[PDB]
Protein backbone atom coordinates (compact mmCIF):
# COMPACT_ATOMS: atom_id res chain seq x y z
CA UNK A 1 0.00 0.00 0.00
CA UNK A 2 1.38 3.37 -1.18
CA UNK A 3 0.16 6.68 -2.60
CA UNK A 4 -2.19 6.19 -5.52
CA UNK A 5 -2.74 8.26 -8.62
CA UNK A 6 -6.04 10.03 -8.54
CA UNK A 7 -7.87 11.19 -11.55
CA UNK A 8 -10.55 13.65 -10.65
CA UNK A 9 -13.08 14.70 -13.15
CA UNK A 10 -15.60 17.37 -12.66
CA UNK A 11 -18.63 17.07 -14.87
CA UNK A 12 -21.22 19.47 -16.02
CA UNK A 13 -24.02 19.03 -18.46
CA UNK A 14 -26.70 21.64 -18.68
CA UNK A 15 -29.77 19.98 -17.46
CA UNK A 16 -27.96 17.35 -15.54
CA UNK A 17 -30.82 17.93 -13.18
CA UNK A 18 -33.58 16.78 -15.56
CA UNK A 19 -33.77 13.22 -16.79
CA UNK A 20 -31.19 11.76 -14.48
CA UNK A 21 -28.33 12.03 -16.87
CA UNK A 22 -25.86 11.21 -14.23
CA UNK A 23 -28.15 8.80 -12.46
CA UNK A 24 -25.93 5.86 -12.92
CA UNK A 25 -22.71 7.45 -11.84
CA UNK A 26 -21.07 7.26 -8.46
CA UNK A 27 -19.66 10.37 -7.02
CA UNK A 28 -17.42 8.58 -4.61
CA UNK A 29 -13.80 7.56 -4.94
CA UNK A 30 -13.37 4.26 -6.63
CA UNK A 31 -10.19 2.35 -6.79
CA UNK A 32 -9.36 0.47 -9.94
CA UNK A 33 -6.51 -1.64 -11.26
CA UNK A 34 -4.27 -0.32 -13.94
CA UNK A 35 -5.01 -3.22 -16.20
CA UNK A 36 -8.59 -2.14 -16.69
CA UNK A 37 -9.91 -0.01 -19.46
CA UNK A 38 -12.50 2.41 -18.35
CA UNK A 39 -15.37 3.04 -20.66
CA UNK A 40 -17.97 5.81 -20.79
CA UNK A 41 -21.25 5.11 -22.47
CA UNK A 42 -24.94 4.80 -22.83
CA UNK A 43 -24.61 1.10 -22.40
CA UNK A 44 -25.00 -0.27 -18.96
CA UNK A 45 -23.24 -3.31 -20.23
CA UNK A 46 -19.56 -2.70 -20.81
CA UNK A 47 -19.21 0.69 -19.21
CA UNK A 48 -18.03 1.61 -15.80
CA UNK A 49 -19.74 4.88 -16.18
CA UNK A 50 -23.06 5.15 -17.84
CA UNK A 51 -24.92 8.15 -19.09
CA UNK A 52 -28.65 7.89 -19.62
CA UNK A 53 -28.70 10.03 -22.71
CA UNK A 54 -30.27 9.31 -26.04
CA UNK A 55 -27.42 11.32 -27.56
CA UNK A 56 -24.36 9.76 -25.99
CA UNK A 57 -23.08 6.95 -28.20
CA UNK A 58 -23.56 3.51 -26.80
CA UNK A 59 -19.89 3.72 -25.93
CA UNK A 60 -18.43 7.17 -26.01
CA UNK A 61 -14.81 7.22 -25.09
CA UNK A 62 -12.44 5.25 -23.00
CA UNK A 63 -9.48 5.72 -20.75
CA UNK A 64 -6.53 3.50 -20.43
CA UNK A 65 -3.48 3.90 -18.31
CA UNK A 66 0.11 3.32 -19.09
CA UNK A 67 3.43 4.84 -18.29
CA UNK A 68 5.63 6.94 -20.46
CA UNK A 69 8.99 5.70 -21.34
CA UNK A 70 11.26 7.47 -18.98
CA UNK A 71 8.59 8.11 -16.43
CA UNK A 72 8.00 6.37 -13.16
CA UNK A 73 4.35 7.23 -12.96
CA UNK A 74 1.14 6.32 -14.70
CA UNK A 75 -0.52 8.44 -17.33
CA UNK A 76 -3.84 8.19 -19.07
CA UNK A 77 -4.76 7.90 -22.70
CA UNK A 78 -8.17 8.73 -24.00
CA UNK A 79 -9.67 7.23 -27.13
CA UNK A 80 -12.81 8.18 -28.88
CA UNK A 81 -15.41 5.66 -29.78
CA UNK A 82 -18.23 7.41 -31.41
CA UNK A 83 -18.74 7.60 -35.12
CA UNK A 84 -21.39 10.16 -34.42
CA UNK A 85 -19.85 12.81 -32.21
CA UNK A 86 -16.26 14.04 -31.92
CA UNK A 87 -14.48 14.29 -28.63
CA UNK A 88 -12.81 17.56 -28.10
CA UNK A 89 -9.89 17.61 -25.76
CA UNK A 90 -8.63 21.08 -25.11
CA UNK A 91 -9.71 22.29 -28.54
CA UNK A 92 -8.51 19.38 -30.56
CA UNK A 93 -11.14 17.17 -32.00
CA UNK A 94 -10.85 13.42 -31.94
CA UNK A 95 -12.69 11.46 -34.56
CA UNK A 96 -13.73 7.88 -34.40
CA UNK A 97 -10.99 5.88 -32.78
CA UNK A 98 -8.56 8.70 -32.66
CA UNK A 99 -6.70 8.75 -29.40
CA UNK A 100 -4.21 10.78 -27.44
CA UNK A 101 -2.26 11.14 -24.30
CA UNK A 102 -3.94 13.11 -21.61
CA UNK A 103 -2.49 16.24 -20.09
CA UNK A 104 -2.39 16.37 -16.36
CA UNK A 105 -5.32 18.71 -16.67
CA UNK A 106 -7.66 19.25 -19.57
CA UNK A 107 -11.19 19.84 -20.71
CA UNK A 108 -12.75 16.88 -22.36
CA UNK A 109 -15.96 17.69 -24.08
CA UNK A 110 -18.59 16.06 -26.23
CA UNK A 111 -22.05 17.13 -27.09
CA UNK A 112 -23.16 19.27 -24.23
CA UNK A 113 -21.13 17.32 -21.75
CA UNK A 114 -18.17 18.82 -20.02
CA UNK A 115 -15.54 17.03 -18.12
CA UNK A 116 -12.77 18.72 -16.35
CA UNK A 117 -10.01 16.33 -15.52
CA UNK A 118 -7.10 16.65 -13.25
CA UNK A 119 -4.64 13.98 -12.37
CA UNK A 120 -2.60 13.76 -9.21
CA UNK A 121 0.27 11.32 -9.31
CA UNK A 122 0.77 8.44 -6.90
CA UNK A 123 3.51 5.99 -6.12
CA UNK A 124 1.49 2.99 -7.02
CA UNK A 125 1.44 1.39 -10.36
CA UNK A 126 -1.19 -1.28 -9.93
CA UNK A 127 -4.12 0.76 -8.83
CA UNK A 128 -5.47 4.18 -9.45
CA UNK A 129 -8.55 5.82 -8.15
CA UNK A 130 -11.00 7.98 -9.96
CA UNK A 131 -13.37 10.47 -8.43
CA UNK A 132 -16.35 12.23 -9.95
CA UNK A 133 -17.32 15.74 -8.91
CA UNK A 134 -20.35 17.72 -9.82
CA UNK A 135 -20.31 21.18 -11.10
CA UNK A 136 -23.16 23.51 -10.45
CA UNK A 137 -22.32 25.79 -13.33
CA UNK A 138 -20.71 25.52 -16.77
CA UNK A 139 -16.99 25.11 -16.75
CA UNK A 140 -16.42 27.37 -19.74
CA UNK A 141 -15.79 31.07 -19.11
Amino acid sequence: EETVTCLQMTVYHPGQLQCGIFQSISFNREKLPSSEVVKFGRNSNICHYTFQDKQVSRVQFSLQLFKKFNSSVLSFEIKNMSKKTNLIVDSRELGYLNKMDLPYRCMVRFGEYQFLMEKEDGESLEFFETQFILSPRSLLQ
Partner: peptide
Protein backbone atom coordinates in the same frame (compact mmCIF):
# COMPACT_ATOMS: atom_id res chain seq x y z
CA UNK B 1 -41.62 1.05 -28.09
CA UNK B 2 -37.96 2.05 -28.04
CA UNK B 3 -35.21 0.01 -26.37
CA UNK B 4 -32.83 2.40 -24.67
CA UNK B 5 -29.39 0.94 -24.27
CA UNK B 6 -29.45 -0.48 -27.81
CA UNK B 7 -31.02 2.37 -29.75
CA UNK B 8 -29.15 4.31 -32.36
CA UNK B 9 -27.46 7.44 -31.17
CA UNK B 10 -29.49 10.46 -31.79
CA UNK B 11 -28.12 13.71 -32.98
CA UNK B 12 -29.76 17.04 -32.38
Amino acid sequence: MTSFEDADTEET
